Amino acid sequence: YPIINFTTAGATVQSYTNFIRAVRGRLTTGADVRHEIPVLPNRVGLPINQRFILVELSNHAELSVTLALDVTNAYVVGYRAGNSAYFFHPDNQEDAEAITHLFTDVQNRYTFAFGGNYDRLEQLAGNLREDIELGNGPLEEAISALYYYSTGGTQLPTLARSFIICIQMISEAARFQYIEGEMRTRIRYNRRSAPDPSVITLENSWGRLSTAIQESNQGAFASPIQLQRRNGSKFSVYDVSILIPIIALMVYRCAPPPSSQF
Ligand SMILES: OC[C@H]1O[C@H](O[C@H]2O[C@H](CO)[C@@H](O)[C@H](O)[C@H]2O)[C@H](O)[C@@H](O)[C@@H]1O
Ligand SMILES: OC[C@H]1O[C@H](O[C@H]2O[C@H](CO)[C@@H](O)[C@H](O)[C@H]2O)[C@H](O)[C@@H](O)[C@@H]1O
């Protein structure tokens, strides 16, 4: 599977930008674009040899871990650190079989009894996303935390917190130029801060936005989607147009209707 590298060591807006751009480049194929927004490969009919991509993360502490991302949703399904690999609890038998194709040479394979969704991870971390700082510092720390898990150096709450950090700074950033921008800003000013409502609501609405855009009538949503601004106030989305600078890719929801141009 394709590998994209990134290190928090001496990270800059440009190096992070290159990283996210490369990740998106391995996620979408260009075969499916709707209203100018790329769609991820459809799970249905997708060959296993094209199912995952790997993100090799390194940090200033000279530690490295490899995250595995599912190309169908850009989400993290597991990771490898040294001679051990850990996978989030699969949703079904097909996915359980699919992950056996990852880190096949690792000496110790483990599947967590818990899933990688935020609800579950927040419960295990003992903190909500709104209370977990993001930025290059948090990522640097998260990489070390993931690395030290197999030896008992990392407690479960810290592990979960670290997953929450990685997922948002990699998966959500790949999904939304807006979130990529949020991380770029944190890097530019070496600031670590929790995601505000605009970030949280986008993360929570990615699936719905993907469906709304794909089911839209020439871009017009059948029903509006409510997002939130930085101050928590409502922002109504009625059309795909307002999302062009915001969402970078979508999960496949339905087949694109015929061109049907006038
Ligand atoms: O801000 C750019 C640097 O970010 C990381 O380092 C910072 O994060 C560390 C862990 O929290 C802090 O100890 C340090 O004080 C922060 O500046 C990265 O590890 C550095 O290599 C980057 O230059
Ligand atoms: O059309 C080619 C094959 O598609 C199936 O297999 C792919 O899609 C599945 C999910 O729908 C994956 O689980 C599988 O690994 C992929 O190869 C279909 O089941 C096969 O009969 C078709 O030949």
Curated annotation (Swiss-Prot):
Coiled coil ranges (UniProt) are none
List of residues binding AMP: Y75, V76, G116, N117, Y118
According to the record, which residues are glycosylated? Answer: N5, N231
Residues that coordinate or bind a carbohydrate: I3, I4, N5, G10, G45, N136, G137, P138, L139, E140, E141, N190, R191, R192
> What residues sit in the active site?
Y75, Y118, E172, R175
Query: What is catalyzed by this enzyme?
Result: Endohydrolysis of the N-glycosidic bond at one specific adenosine on the 28S rRNA
Record's superkingdom? Answer: Eukaryota
Biotechnological utility: A deglycosylated form may be linked to monoclonal antibodies to produce immunotoxins exploited in cancer treatment. However, a point mutation should be introduced to eliminate vascular leak syndrome, a side effect resulting from endothelial damage.
Q: What does this protein do?
A: Acts as a glycosidase that removes a specific adenine residue from an exposed loop of the 28S rRNA (A4324 in mammals), leading to rRNA breakage. As this loop is involved in elongation factor binding, modified ribosomes are catalytically inactive and unable to support protein synthesis. Can inactivate a few thousand ribosomes per minute, faster than the cell can make new ones. Therefore a single molecule can kill an animal cell.
Q: What is this protein called?
A: Ricin A chain
Please name the source species. Ricinus communis (Castor bean)
Its taxonomic placement starts with: Eukaryota, Viridiplantae, Streptophyta, Embryophyta, Tracheophyta
- Where the shown chain sits in the full protein? 41 to 302 of 576
